[PDB]
Write a protein that binds this ligand. Sequence first.
Ligand SMILES: CC(C)CN(C[C@@H](O)[C@H](Cc1ccccc1)NC(=O)O[C@H]1CO[C@H]2OCC[C@H]21)S(=O)(=O)c1ccc(N)cc1
Ligand SMILES: [Cl-]
Ligand SMILES: [Cl-]
Ligand code: NA
Lengths: 99, 99
Amino acid sequence: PQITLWKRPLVTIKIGGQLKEALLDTGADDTVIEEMSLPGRWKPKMIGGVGGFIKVRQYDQIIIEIAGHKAIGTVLVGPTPVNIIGRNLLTQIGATLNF
Amino acid sequence: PQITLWKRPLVTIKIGGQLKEALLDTGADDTVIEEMSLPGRWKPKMIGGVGGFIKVRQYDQIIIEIAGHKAIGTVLVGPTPVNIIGRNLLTQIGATLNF
Ligand SMILES: CC(C)CN(C[C@@H](O)[C@H](Cc1ccccc1)NC(=O)O[C@H]1CO[C@H]2OCC[C@H]21)S(=O)(=O)c1ccc(N)cc1
Ligand SMILES: [Cl-]
Ligand SMILES: [Cl-]
Ligand code: NA
């Protein structure tokens, strides 16, 4: 698809068998999702945005469908205000910015 | 141009007579620049992201040149850790996400 930016670029994702809404975010290095259960071990990480930093849980090699495209990669879990698909998984689905 | 997302999508902008580097950020509703002077009226605003909220000055009808493309709109000025070009100006340069 070609997604314009007049509204938020929200898509459906599927993770752990559950559908969620997430933002395609070229300003995010990292995918970060709201609190949920994921399999395996996690590692600590801090991520910093406009209001400061938060602690998140880093899960690696997580299966996640994004707008119907399959990705397998790192998902951060923590008190983000919105689910965000960052560049680590945008590259897996072949996304580019065009103007 | 077509900008891949292996690295942060940074571009050169011109704003208020000044050249700056800024992030093309589809996850940002609004454009937010580090502290600088801009002419004209402003009003205070709070914007929230990961980490919480910051207080900014909202300047309307500001012209910015973004990687060679002129646009006008609202620019928020405050203690953002990174200069961010948000959707309000991305739309004006015809930026899309494609995959
Ligand atoms: C500020 C950026 C350099 C980094 N952010 C991504 C950014 O796109 C967020 C993503 C985002 C979106 C909604 C809520 C929180 C964060 N947008 C944002 O802060 O935009 C603000 C300006 O316009 C407003 O519209 C959205 C909030 C305001 S971030 O959310 O802090 C973040 C940082 C690191 C990772 N790995 C993932 C996300
Ligand atoms: Cl605007
Ligand atoms: Cl358009
Ligand atoms: Na103005």
